[PDB]
Amino acid sequence: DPGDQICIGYHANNSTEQVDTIMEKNVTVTHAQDILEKKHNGKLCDLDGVKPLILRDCSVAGWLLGNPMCDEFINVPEWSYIVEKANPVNDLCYPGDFNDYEELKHLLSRINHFEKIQIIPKSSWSSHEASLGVSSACPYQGKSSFFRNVVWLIKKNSTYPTIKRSYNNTNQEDLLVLWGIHHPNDAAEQTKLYQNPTTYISVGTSTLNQRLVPRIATRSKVNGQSGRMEFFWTILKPNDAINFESNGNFIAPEYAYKIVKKGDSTIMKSELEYGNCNTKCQTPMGAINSSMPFHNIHPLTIGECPKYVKSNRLVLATGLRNSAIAGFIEGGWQGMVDGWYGYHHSNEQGSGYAADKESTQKAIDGVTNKVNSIIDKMNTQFEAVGREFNNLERRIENLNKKMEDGFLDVWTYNAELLVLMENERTLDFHDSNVKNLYDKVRLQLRDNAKELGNGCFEFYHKCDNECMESVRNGTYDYPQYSEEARLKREE
Amino acid sequence: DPGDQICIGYHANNSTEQVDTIMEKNVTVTHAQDILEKKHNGKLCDLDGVKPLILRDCSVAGWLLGNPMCDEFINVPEWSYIVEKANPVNDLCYPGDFNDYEELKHLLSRINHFEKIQIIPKSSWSSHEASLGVSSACPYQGKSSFFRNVVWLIKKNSTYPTIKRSYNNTNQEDLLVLWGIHHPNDAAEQTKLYQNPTTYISVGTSTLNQRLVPRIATRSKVNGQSGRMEFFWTILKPNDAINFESNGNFIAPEYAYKIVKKGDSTIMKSELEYGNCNTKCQTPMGAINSSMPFHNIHPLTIGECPKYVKSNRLVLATGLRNSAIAGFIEGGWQGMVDGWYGYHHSNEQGSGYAADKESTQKAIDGVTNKVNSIIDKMNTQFEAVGREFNNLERRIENLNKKMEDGFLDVWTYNAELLVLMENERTLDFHDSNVKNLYDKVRLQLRDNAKELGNGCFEFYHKCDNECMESVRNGTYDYPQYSEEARLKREE
Amino acid sequence: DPGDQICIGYHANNSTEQVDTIMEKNVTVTHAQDILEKKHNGKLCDLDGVKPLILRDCSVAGWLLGNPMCDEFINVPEWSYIVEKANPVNDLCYPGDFNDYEELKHLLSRINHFEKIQIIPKSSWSSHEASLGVSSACPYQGKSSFFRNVVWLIKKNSTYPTIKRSYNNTNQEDLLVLWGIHHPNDAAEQTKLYQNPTTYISVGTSTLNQRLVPRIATRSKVNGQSGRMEFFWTILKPNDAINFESNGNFIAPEYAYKIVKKGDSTIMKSELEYGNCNTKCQTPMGAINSSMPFHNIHPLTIGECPKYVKSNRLVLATGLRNSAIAGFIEGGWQGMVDGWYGYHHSNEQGSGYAADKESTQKAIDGVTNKVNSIIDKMNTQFEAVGREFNNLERRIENLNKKMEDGFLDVWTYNAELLVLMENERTLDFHDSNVKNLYDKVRLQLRDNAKELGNGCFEFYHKCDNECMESVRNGTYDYPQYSEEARLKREE
Ligand SMILES: *[C@@H]1O[C@H](CO)[C@@H](O)[C@H](O)[C@H]1NC(C)=O
Ligand SMILES: *[C@@H]1O[C@H](CO)[C@@H](O)[C@H](O)[C@H]1NC(C)=O
Ligand SMILES: *[C@@H]1O[C@H](CO)[C@@H](O)[C@H](O)[C@H]1NC(C)=O
Ligand SMILES: *[C@@H]1O[C@H](CO)[C@@H](O)[C@H](O)[C@H]1NC(C)=O
Ligand SMILES: *[C@@H]1O[C@H](CO)[C@@H](O)[C@H](O)[C@H]1NC(C)=O
Ligand SMILES: *[C@@H]1O[C@H](CO)[C@@H](O)[C@H](O)[C@H]1NC(C)=O
Ligand SMILES: *[C@@H]1O[C@H](CO)[C@@H](O)[C@H](O)[C@H]1NC(C)=O
Ligand SMILES: *[C@@H]1O[C@H](CO)[C@@H](O)[C@H](O)[C@H]1NC(C)=O
Ligand SMILES: *[C@@H]1O[C@H](CO)[C@@H](O)[C@H](O)[C@H]1NC(C)=O
Ligand SMILES: *[C@@H]1O[C@H](CO)[C@@H](O)[C@H](O)[C@H]1NC(C)=O
Ligand SMILES: *[C@@H]1O[C@H](CO)[C@@H](O)[C@H](O)[C@H]1NC(C)=O
Ligand SMILES: *[C@@H]1O[C@H](CO)[C@@H](O)[C@H](O)[C@H]1NC(C)=O
Secondary structure (H helix, E strand, O other), X not given: OOOOEEEEEEEOOOOOOEEOOOOOOOEEEOOEEXXXXXXXXXXXXXXXXXXXXXXXXXXXXXXXXXXXOOOOOOOOOOEOOEEEOXXXXXXXXXXXXXXXXXXXXXXXXXXXXXXXXXOOOHHHOOOOEOOOOXXXXXXXXXXXXXXXXXXXXXXXXXXXXXXXXXXXXXXXXXXXXXXXXXXXXXXXXXXXXXXXXXXXXXXXXXXXXXXXOOOXXXXXXXXXXXXXXXEEEEEEOOOOEEEEEEOOOEEEEOEEEEEEOOOOOOEEEOOOOEXXXXXXXXXXXXXXXXXXXEEOOOOOOEEOOOEEOOOOOOEEEOOXXXXXXXXXXXXXXXXXXXXXXXEEEEEOOEEEEEEOHHHHHHHHHHHHHHHHXXXXXXXXXXXXXXXXOOOOOHHHHHHHHHHHHHHHHHHHHHHHHHHHHHHHHHHHHXXXXXXXXXXXXXXXXHHHEEEOOOOEEEEOOOOOHHHXXXXXXXXXXXXXXXXXXXXXXXX | OOOOEEEEEEEOOOOOOEEOOOOOOOEEEOOEEEOEEOOOOOOEEEEOOOOOXXXXXXXXXXXXXXXXXXXXXXXXXXXXXXXEOOOOOEOOOOOEEEOOHHHHHHHHOOEOXXXXXXXXXXXXXXXXXXXXXXXXXXXXXXXXXXXXXXXXXXXXXXXXXXXXXXEEOOOOOEEEEEEEEEEOOOHHHHHHHHOOOXXXXXXXXXXXXXXXXXXXXXXXXXXXXXXXXXXEEEEEXXXXXXXXXXXXXXXXXXXXEEEEOOOOOOEEXXXXXXXXEXXXXXXXXXXXXXXXXXXXXXXXXXXXXXXXXXXXXXXXEOOOEOXXXXXXXXXXXXXXXXXXXXXXXXXXXXXXXXXXXXXXXXXXXXXXXXXXXXXXXXXXXXXXXXXXXXXXXXXXXXXXXXXXXXXXXXXXXXXXXXXXXXXXXXXXXXXXXXXXXXXXXXXXXXXXXXXXXOOEEEEOOOOOHHHHHHHHHOOOOOXXXXXXXXXXXXX | OOOOEEEEEEEOOOOOOEEOOOOOOOEEEOOEEEOEEOOOOOOEEEEXXXXXXXXXXXXXXXXXXXXXXXXXXOOOOOEOOEEEOOOOOXXXXXXXXXXXXXXXXXXXXXXXXXXXXXXXXXXXXXXXXOOOOOEEEEEOOOOEEOOOOEEEOEOEOOEOOOEEEEEEOOOOOEEEEEEEEEEOOOHHHHHHHHOOOOOOEEEEOOOOEXXXXXXXXXXXXXXXXXXXXXXXXXXXXXXXEEEEEEOOOEEEEOEEEEEEOOOXXXXXXXXXXXXXXXXXXXXXXXXXXXXXXXXXXXXXXXEOOOEEOOOOOOXXXXXXXXXXXXXXXXXXXXXXXXXXXXXXXXXXXXXXXXXXXXXXXXXXXXXXXXXXXXXXXXXXXXXXXXXXXXXXXXXXXXXXXXXXXXXHHHHHHHHHHHHHHHHHXXXXXXXXXXXXXXXXXXXXXXXXXXXXXXXXXEEOOOOOHHHHHHHHHOOOOOHHHHHHHHHHHOO
């Protein structure tokens, strides 16, 4: 009237944070953690401390050949990836084609050193016109012009003698060399420009064995030209020579490019500003600081990125189901201001809440470990995802699509089920921990107290604060009080 | 002699349905659900309400060029995919080759609009023979013939003047244009057919810059011909023109094809009948209504399909382990005609079974949620799986094989383990629910009754049907009967 | 003073074996099993009882054409895969190129029958020089030589008459036929070697329609040659004929190869010895006997292999957490020499340990099943992983890299989490089993004994060895002793 009491219960708070489990939707929970990265800085950034190459209105092709309408950031000796607009305004001003263009973009996607040098001075053409090879298709300062890195040689007097030029790579580095051939409209234009009716370009390295022949066809006007310019490239190794021989139609190198190549990336399509930021994961929509194992921003990423997932939320439960003084069988304790599982007692020294420090710490460590495993076991590797295939490589582009879609399907399913399964394990863990605490006490107390059925015990003896501490410590001395207990019990 | 009683127990039935768990094989279970789709309608069907193009005995090539032995369904203005036989009987009647054939099949796999038009009338050839270009290799009504969409021009008198033809696409739609070149057996055949010993075909658009030259070689007879026909195609954009120039060996266009293209699919190899059905997933062996997240019919599918898996059964447990009146410790209750977990009682008003409605509903909802999650979290995307690579693309075909086999291995393993793990969770859930019910009662009753050890309690007081209902409701008033209980108890 | 006793407890041993769970790191455990294969025999082995083709210092190209510096194992009529060194010393002694080289390596990766035959005897050249076609680039026994399978025909007197040669495949098997063209340095060398200034090679089968023309360019010296040799191949079906016609520059077949092809593999890069072993999984670093579902040796494997994983250990718990006489609440029993869960008793016949055979067997079966499922559900398929793409196929090689890296990421994550999740299930299973045993006893004994709170019961009646056996058997007859029990109890 009334006997001392100890109750077992668990933390409750004012959290409205919701979680899903394999078995229940929308469970209110004490604390939760999202493992889905959803935020980007809306900028293009350095990748592992190397600037990108941003081409504002120029194709890689326009940029390499010196399309004179390309007004770009000129000096840039290395880069980590390339940014183009979807459809650049300035490509090949004089219409035509670039041989193995996509393989060259991929080779140039990431470059350790890039330095333009002069391999054949425009001034070295003594028996051909170096300054007439100009077109209204390729306008400069209002006046007719041409690609600036490459020379459109025309006949001098009414003669086009055979060109023989060798260039020996005396540099330490590989040379990217560019040249072209003019496909004229007819035999009259052919002889008007090059005098000789039948022409070739021969090009030889230790590797290359090329002979080009112009092709006449009747073609639609593009940039007001029915002629076509076709471009070719090789990499000249650092002690090899390249040998040019031509009768006509030769678009000669003036400038070539020293390159050092240490691994590739790809070409990103984006309309974003550079932002001086560093990042380890770039997206067409912005960069990401990628601690989280999953993201939903954009598939077309370059770097060490979270796995891309079709998903709005991946929220793990970290806390508990959230809902005399009665114990656990009737709900949680707002009063348990600290601790996850613990006790409420009332004796002649007064009443209050005490955390079970040991079971609380064990459980916090467990849940922290669960979250860190799900994050830290994720293998993160460098990859570069772009669209590098042309409109006659549609079968290969379909192969890439099935693979990308394939991985999106596997990761989206596994992350969703992983969160549902583990959330159910976590909430069941909390129930298992509370019930085990109740049993820890029930087994110490035996017949020295009575189970009240609500998660509380009423003692058959005086249990001061020091007795209570021994119950919470698991050091309760049953023999010490069996005598006093038995007297009140038999009555 | 004898006291009132309440027992805790669970549903049992005459089910022989079996399930596997990570830990036990062949567990008999009250109710189970298969999540593996194994059934197909054995027919080719519309895909999202668009008919397929079924070519009974004709290659795409034979069909486009008008191989005169192709007796096909002529009119068909759109389609969702193409069906060919493994080795069609009718391909190129006059032997030869089709340039970038596989890329053209892929472009044509799915078409929004397809309409054949006449771009160059057979009657427009005033200075060349339009009706002699015929062969015994390409038989029609017993008589020698040729591809019907394309004209094999021969010299007239003993002259083959230079052809110059332009066609301007004044249509709203892209044009697929087809032409070819004849590779004759020798210089005598060359001049016998075309008079001129040295010939070319030049073709130009805003894109195309082609010059073809016939090739003599001594070749094996195919369909009794040692000559070869080589075919080329372009897509002419809706305000461009195509310009043809030829000296000889020209297989001229007569008919071209207006096309509208909105996304691709692939070419399916099947010997099935069309069936007027609609479907969202087509298989070479038949269509599928794809609610289930997995299937085992065939890898080579087109549409939004379940994931393909090497597996005969993926069966989830939905019910319970299946096996006075004693309670749960001795087995299940055939008498529990309704409910999963509940009670049996016996008092002076009589005996019977009562379902624990709350715990039963919670558990049914849980298991329904588990099944729906495993089904509904599956990301389903459109894909088209075929074999689109030629016998010099074997490395790329091996790349595709490793990817396909890769995904089959991941999905087959994850589905099998998913079912084994969750089956074990489900059966352990049922045990956890029954035991918690027993405890719900034990904690209400305390010393007002005695545990019989078999899942039953014997009351120390009269418990009429209204007392029993309060035990099942969790509203049992222990104080109301402690007095009566204690008297019978002390004795 | 003192009463008979029965205790519930579990096995403990001197194991230091450690395991991880989703929630705890470094749990000491009674017994564990690694499912990650980490061991290889450091040798190249037969694959499913078929020898490899090991090329010690020769390229496939060098080997097929008979580079005279290739000192290889000559006779070898079938093989399962090919082994090359990263950069073979002996390739094309006379510099040049091999057309569709990579597709030919892939075709030859695995061969059922391979037999070199003579299709055109060197002695059959009556109007051309068959023994002058020799070079200092291709040295033999100190003296100038050439590829041995193919004849470099030179003019005789000062004449190079037109070659016309047919070979009809009268063999039962497909023929791999090889030929080439010489690209000389200039018009003087052209006529010095072949007399005719303007030359061609025409080659025709039922399939092939080729016309080759030599190409002059000024080229860097390689093996002291500025000339180039370009090689071509076809597969001649078993009743077709191949027809050669040439004016000059013809590198003629002498020897061709009968082949039978039944499925492909790839080319492995390794510096290992053959070892007479058989295997179902070969690695560049050594073979594997692949019972385990995962391995971490090397990605570039051929056969039916475990899944490749970035991981040092995948260790499953199979045993228990490892740590009067007290029962389970105070730790494990070194004394439980046999069994997982069981009992300790003490009566007037003496004291000792007894295994709960039924619950122990159920648990051993469960854990054995868990391990076997995780191993046996793994779909294992034949695959061949190599690097088969050239330096202008870098985009496709990047496609293959993303796929390979993709599968490594999926398998590494799923195996790591699978082991963490199941380890937690296994340890929780053991706790659930021990606690259920304690309850099995508590429910049989009821008030005929008292719970001591440490996992032990003290009996209120004499419990001889035969009573004890009935408690362990679940056949304990409570009524038989309630009388004796109640007397000692009321006191
Ligand atoms: C869960 O919560 C949200 C409210 O934020 C609601 O939209 C949804 O309908 C709820 N229930 C289910 C079954 O998803
Ligand atoms: C071209 O150059 C000069 C005339 O300026 C003259 O010496 C030369 O012969 C001219 N050639 C011809 C063929 O007119
Ligand atoms: C280029 O110059 C170097 C250094 O003078 C020389 O050794 C080398 O042979 C030259 N390269 C060629 C292909 O001639
Ligand atoms: C637990 O509580 C008792 C009583 O307050 C105290 O004396 C003892 O030091 C504690 N025991 C342990 C092991 O912490
Ligand atoms: C399980 O059930 C089937 C009978 O339908 C039987 O074939 C199989 O052998 C049984 N046991 C095991 C271990 O698979
Ligand atoms: C061919 O056409 C007619 C003869 O029918 C004639 O006017 C023409 O000159 C003929 N040509 C030759 C060269 O025979
Ligand atoms: C085709 O006709 C249109 C309309 O007459 C014209 O504007 C267009 O320029 C023509 N196309 C070409 C390439 O000439
Ligand atoms: C439960 O049972 C009692 C006795 O039949 C009834 O009076 C009461 O309305 C019920 N209580 C609830 C909360 O359903
Ligand atoms: C676990 O065990 C190993 C000792 O073998 C140790 O290196 C490691 O630091 C321990 N703890 C954790 C948290 O990994
Ligand atoms: C080459 O062969 C012999 C000389 O040995 C002779 O009959 C033949 O005419 C020679 N040809 C020429 C054109 O010298
Ligand atoms: C090759 O010889 C066979 C048998 O004599 C013959 O039937 C076949 O037609 C020949 N092949 C060719 C293409 O001539
Ligand atoms: C169990 O133990 C009792 C007493 O030793 C023995 O008589 C009986 O045969 C056993 N019962 C069973 C079912 O094994």
